[PDB]
Amino acid sequence: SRHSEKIAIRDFQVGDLVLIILDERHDNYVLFTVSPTLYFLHSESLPALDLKPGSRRPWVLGKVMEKEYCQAKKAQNRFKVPLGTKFYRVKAVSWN
Amino acid sequence: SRHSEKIAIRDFQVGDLVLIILDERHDNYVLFTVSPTLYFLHSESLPALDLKPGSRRPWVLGKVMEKEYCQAKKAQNRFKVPLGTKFYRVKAVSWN
Amino acid sequence: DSDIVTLEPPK
Amino acid sequence: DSDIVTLEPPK
Ligand SMILES: OCCOCCOCC(CO)(COCCO)COCCO
Ligand SMILES: OCCOCCOCC(CO)(COCCO)COCCO
């Protein structure tokens, strides 16, 4: 009986309910998606979601509040992606 | 711009849009879910979803049309679950 | 066919 | 901070 609990899985827009999951390969939280594009959770959003950086909560529901398209310009980078990867950084808040 | 493409992730009901994914540990398609309960795709549903039994499509969207609660009564069973596991079998059809 | 049994049919 | 660059800010 969860009429409202339906998540977006791609093409994320402000206001979408999303599942935020731990990605151990990139050592970061990401949006669950069917797309191959990566949507990393912005480090700013972790406190609002009761998540911690670096028991470790495997998923949380949130709402997208902002998205930014970015590119890795160093092979050593915060998201452990190959040089040149284009990806999104997403700020999300907790959901009711 | 996918207003309608929002999936249920637990407590599945008839009519829910769901993501059906390959589970290689159980060698079967399952509903993507945050619950630890398993929701296996019924073998009857594979043709309707353009899936094949046993390139192998990693996911497809579908709508739940029926769910049945079941228990494994043999340690060797079709879903590779431990003896005694209770789980659901779900019939789903393709989505628009 | 008897590897699994139905506990609760569809509601 | 320069490991990544912004290509497109939020719309
Ligand atoms: O991140 C992996 C790449 O994802 C893009 C393809 O989507 C795959 C999904 C969604 O991520 C993986 O499910 C595991 C997610 O935690 C669903 O597909 C099931 C394949 O068995
Ligand atoms: O099936 C594994 C058990 O699932 C129950 C917990 O949900 C875990 C999820 C959803 O299945 C796994 O994402 C991988 C799914 O393909 C989301 O959690 C992310 C943890 O990193």
Side-chain angles (χ1 to χ4, degrees), chain B residues 1-2 6-7 12 25 28 50-51 70 79 82:
Chain B
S1 36
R2 305 183 178 272
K6 305 286 179 291
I7 62 168
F12 300 106
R25 184 201 221 295
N28 211 86
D50 203 25
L51 302 177
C70 299
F79 297 128

Short mmCIF file of all heavy atoms in Angstrom, two decimals, chain B residues 1-2 6-7 12 25 28 50-51 70 79 82:
data_model
loop_
_atom_site.label_atom_id
_atom_site.label_comp_id
_atom_site.label_asym_id
_atom_site.label_seq_id
_atom_site.Cartn_x
_atom_site.Cartn_y
_atom_site.Cartn_z
N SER B 1 12.14 13.72 -19.06
CA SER B 1 10.71 13.96 -19.25
C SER B 1 9.89 12.66 -19.25
O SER B 1 9.09 12.40 -20.16
CB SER B 1 10.48 14.76 -20.54
OG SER B 1 11.41 14.37 -21.54
N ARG B 2 10.08 11.85 -18.21
CA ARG B 2 9.43 10.53 -18.10
C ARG B 2 8.49 10.53 -16.90
O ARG B 2 8.66 9.74 -15.97
CB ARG B 2 10.45 9.42 -17.98
CG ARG B 2 11.46 9.41 -19.09
CD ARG B 2 12.36 8.20 -18.88
NE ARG B 2 13.36 8.09 -19.95
CZ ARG B 2 13.18 7.44 -21.11
NH1 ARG B 2 12.04 6.81 -21.38
NH2 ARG B 2 14.17 7.40 -21.99
N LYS B 6 7.88 5.60 -13.27
CA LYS B 6 8.25 5.57 -11.87
C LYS B 6 7.92 4.16 -11.39
O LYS B 6 6.78 3.69 -11.59
CB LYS B 6 7.44 6.58 -11.07
CG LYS B 6 7.49 8.08 -11.57
CD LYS B 6 8.81 8.64 -11.21
CE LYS B 6 9.06 10.13 -11.65
NZ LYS B 6 9.15 10.13 -13.15
N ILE B 7 8.87 3.49 -10.77
CA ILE B 7 8.69 2.06 -10.43
C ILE B 7 8.44 1.88 -8.93
O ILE B 7 9.03 2.55 -8.08
CB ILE B 7 9.90 1.18 -10.85
CG1 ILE B 7 11.17 1.58 -10.15
CG2 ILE B 7 10.06 1.17 -12.37
CD1 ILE B 7 12.34 0.55 -10.31
N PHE B 12 4.69 -5.01 -3.68
CA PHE B 12 4.17 -4.90 -5.04
C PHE B 12 2.71 -5.28 -5.11
O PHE B 12 2.27 -6.25 -4.49
CB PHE B 12 4.96 -5.84 -5.94
CG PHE B 12 6.40 -5.48 -5.93
CD1 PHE B 12 7.35 -6.24 -5.25
CD2 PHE B 12 6.84 -4.36 -6.63
CE1 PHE B 12 8.66 -5.88 -5.25
CE2 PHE B 12 8.18 -4.05 -6.68
CZ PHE B 12 9.14 -4.83 -5.96
N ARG B 25 22.72 -15.03 -9.34
CA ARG B 25 22.84 -15.96 -8.23
C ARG B 25 21.72 -17.00 -8.23
O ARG B 25 21.94 -18.18 -7.88
CB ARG B 25 22.82 -15.18 -6.92
CG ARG B 25 23.03 -16.01 -5.69
CD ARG B 25 22.49 -15.29 -4.45
NE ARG B 25 23.38 -15.43 -3.30
CZ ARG B 25 23.65 -16.58 -2.69
NH1 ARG B 25 23.09 -17.71 -3.10
NH2 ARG B 25 24.48 -16.60 -1.66
N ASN B 28 17.66 -16.47 -12.57
CA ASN B 28 16.27 -16.20 -12.91
C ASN B 28 16.08 -14.69 -12.94
O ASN B 28 16.80 -13.96 -12.26
CB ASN B 28 15.37 -16.77 -11.79
CG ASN B 28 13.98 -17.24 -12.29
OD1 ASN B 28 13.86 -18.41 -12.73
ND2 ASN B 28 12.94 -16.40 -12.15
N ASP B 50 9.54 -10.60 -23.96
CA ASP B 50 10.64 -10.81 -24.91
C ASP B 50 11.94 -11.22 -24.20
O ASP B 50 13.04 -10.80 -24.56
CB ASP B 50 10.83 -9.57 -25.81
CG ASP B 50 11.51 -9.89 -27.11
OD1 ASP B 50 11.43 -11.06 -27.57
OD2 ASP B 50 12.12 -8.95 -27.67
N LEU B 51 11.82 -12.05 -23.18
CA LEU B 51 12.91 -12.63 -22.43
C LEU B 51 13.01 -14.11 -22.77
O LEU B 51 12.07 -14.73 -23.27
CB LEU B 51 12.71 -12.50 -20.91
CG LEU B 51 12.55 -11.05 -20.44
CD1 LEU B 51 12.27 -11.07 -18.94
CD2 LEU B 51 13.83 -10.27 -20.72
N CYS B 70 4.98 -18.48 -2.09
CA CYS B 70 5.35 -19.88 -2.26
C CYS B 70 6.45 -20.24 -1.28
O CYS B 70 7.08 -19.37 -0.69
CB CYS B 70 5.95 -20.11 -3.64
SG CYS B 70 4.82 -19.75 -5.04
N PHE B 79 14.66 -22.24 -8.19
CA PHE B 79 15.12 -20.90 -7.94
C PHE B 79 16.42 -20.87 -7.17
O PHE B 79 16.90 -19.79 -6.84
CB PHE B 79 14.04 -20.11 -7.19
CG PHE B 79 12.78 -19.94 -8.00
CD1 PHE B 79 11.56 -20.28 -7.47
CD2 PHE B 79 12.82 -19.39 -9.26
CE1 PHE B 79 10.40 -20.10 -8.21
CE2 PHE B 79 11.68 -19.20 -10.00
CZ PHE B 79 10.46 -19.56 -9.49
N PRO B 82 17.50 -21.70 -0.49
CA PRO B 82 17.61 -22.71 0.57
C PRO B 82 16.26 -23.36 0.87
O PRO B 82 15.20 -22.73 0.74
CB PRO B 82 18.06 -21.88 1.78
CG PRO B 82 18.66 -20.69 1.25
CD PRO B 82 18.04 -20.38 -0.08
#
